[PDB]
Amino acid sequence: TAAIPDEIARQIVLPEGHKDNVPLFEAYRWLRENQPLGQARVEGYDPLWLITKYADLMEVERQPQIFAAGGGEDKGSNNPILANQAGDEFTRQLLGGNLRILDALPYLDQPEHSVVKDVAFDWFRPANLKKWEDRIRETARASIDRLLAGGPDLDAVQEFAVFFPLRVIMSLFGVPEEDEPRMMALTQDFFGVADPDAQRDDIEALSPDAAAQQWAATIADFYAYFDVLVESRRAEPRDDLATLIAVAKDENGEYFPKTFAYGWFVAIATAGHDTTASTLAGCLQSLAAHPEVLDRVKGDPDLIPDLVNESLRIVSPVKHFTRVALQDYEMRGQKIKAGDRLMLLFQSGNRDAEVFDRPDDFDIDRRPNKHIAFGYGPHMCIGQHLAKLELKVMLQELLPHLERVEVSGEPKLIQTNFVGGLRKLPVHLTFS
Ligand code: HEM
Numbered sequence: 303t304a305a306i307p308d309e310i311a312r313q314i315v316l317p318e319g320h321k322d323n324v325p326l327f328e329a330y331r332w333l334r335e336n337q338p339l340g341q342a343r344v345e346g347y348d349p350l351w352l353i354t355k356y357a358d359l360m361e362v363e364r365q366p367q368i369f370a371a372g373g374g375e376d377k378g379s380n381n382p383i384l385a386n387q388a389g390d391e392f393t394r395q396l397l398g399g400n401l402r403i404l405d406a407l408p409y410l411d412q413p414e415h416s417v418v419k420d421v422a423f424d425w426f427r428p429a430n431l432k433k434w435e436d437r438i439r440e441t442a443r444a445s446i447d448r449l450l451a452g453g454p455d456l457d458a459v460q461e462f463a464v465f466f467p468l469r470v471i472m473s474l475f476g477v478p479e480e481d482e483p484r485m486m487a488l489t490q491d492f493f494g495v496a497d498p499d500a501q502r503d504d505i506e507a508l509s510p511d512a513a514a515q516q517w518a519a520t521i522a523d524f525y526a527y528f529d530v531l532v533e534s535r536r537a538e539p540r541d542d543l544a545t546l547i548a549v550a551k552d553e554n555g556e557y558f559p560k561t562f563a564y565g566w567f568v569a570i571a572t573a574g575h576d577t578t579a580s581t582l583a584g585c586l587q588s589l590a591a592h593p594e595v596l597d598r599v600k601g602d603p604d605l606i607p608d609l610v611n612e613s614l615r616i617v618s619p620v621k622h623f624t625r626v627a628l629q630d631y632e633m634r635g636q637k638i639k640a641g642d643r644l645m646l647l648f649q650s651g652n653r654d655a656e657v658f659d660r661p662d663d664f665d666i667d668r669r670p671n672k673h674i675a676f677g678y679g680p681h682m683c684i685g686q687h688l689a690k691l692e693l694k695v696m697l698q699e700l701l702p703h704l705e706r707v708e709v710s711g712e713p714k715l716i717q718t719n720f721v722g723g724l725r726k727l728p729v730h731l732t733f734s
């Protein structure tokens with residue numbers, strides 16, 4: 303019944319707690335082994351049930367009528383992305399009493415979530431993505447040509463891994479190549495709200511609500527950009543994902559409000575590339591630690607999907623979403639009360655020893671690989687099949703050209719409790 307001990311709680315709740323994976327994952331592990339379902343009571347944050355166990359992540363996510371993302375009928379009464387209390391108070395001042403700062407899927411509950419998700423559900427299905435595979439492969443090959451041309455010493459993140467997923471999504475989305483640097487800069491602002499090296503110049507960086515001010519400022523910039531794109535595609539439809547979303551109409555034949563398109567566009571323009579980049583960079587880091595794995599996958603390219611799945615499990619770049627209990631609920635001998643918030647720790651679920659043998663080992667021979675890196679339930683990642691296709695295609699084209707990866711300098715992670723992973727991975731590559 304006791305609260306989680308303060309230093310374990312802070313390690314997971316505070317963005318600074320995620321600056322180094324070793325103490326973070328040790329805190330995950332301490333909870334899974336000693337307090338698998340406890341409440342973190344960190345100063346400046348609401349109390350949070352920390353959902354650390356794989357089974358409990360599934361139990362919560364499969365019950366959206368009990369555990370809401372946005373607050374149920376009181377729309378925007380829960381922030382699905384953990385802000386501090388001061389930040390949620392900033393947002394309630396900005397919006398007028400609620401936290402629904404985007405109309406994007408994470409903020410929605412059923413049935414609204416189901417209606418909006420159905421706009422793009424079919425586009426994202428694996429069979430409907432096959433038509434993009436050749437364009438993806440041409441983009442991978444061009445990115446690899448530049449890697450070979452630039453020589454063996456580089457930052458595998460900022461000088462390689464970031465560009466391929468961004469070009470893929472912007473090409474499919476319909477954003478011109480000259481706008482990629484702007485989308486990359488706003489993505490860094492968006493996922494860097496609490497990172498000391500990613501602060502915007504137009505917000506008070508040291509204010510208690512700084513991250514929330516940066517989140518809002520970045521969204522306003524994305525809205526200004528996407529307003530032009532929505533109007534453009536409504537006026538002149540094209541065969542791109544921007545058009546599918548911009549022209550979408552509800553069951554009465556009326557356009558969805560423009561903010562619904564902007565929500566899709568923010569998600570596609572940020573998570574649509576950043577997570578794939580993180581997973582690719584994490585894969586390279588693991589191939590440096592496990593050179594026998596690189597040798598094996600060059601020997602059998604049919605192992606590439608297994609390598610992708612184990613990179614997703616280990617990297618798990620999307621760290622959490624929050625839920626709120628709409629009624630009292632008992633789980634794992636604990637009494638969650640109506641109104642209590644939950645933090646879904648996907649990275650911890652992915653290390654649960656009840657599910658994965660030697661969960662901290664990089665083992666591509668987990669078959670099936672039961673990872674929960676894409677979450678679960680009706681909110682399960684819509685982009686999962688595009689991410690797995692892009693990572694497969696890039697590795698099929700890249701690994702033949704790599705004999706060895708060496709990490710030659712200190713890796714750096716984005717300091718976030720939300721969408722993280724590497725921002726820097728200095729390497730020495732040996733080309734074949
Ligand atoms: C390695 C790549 C990725 C990982 C690990 C990842 C992971 C996740 C996770 C854990 C969630 C939350 C699921 C939940 O609430 O249960 C999520 C949601 C989502 N992701 Fe992905 N993601 C990846 C790539 C992508 C891509 C490529 C796109 C789009 C092109 C995308 C779009 C979304 C959207 C729109 C949501 C919100 C879904 C909803 O709330 O219904 N993701 N992702």
Ligand SMILES: Cc1ccccc1Cl
Nearest residue numbers: 406408569573620721
């Ligand atoms: C903002 C965001 C982050 C991760 C996955 C999806 C979305 Cl929409």
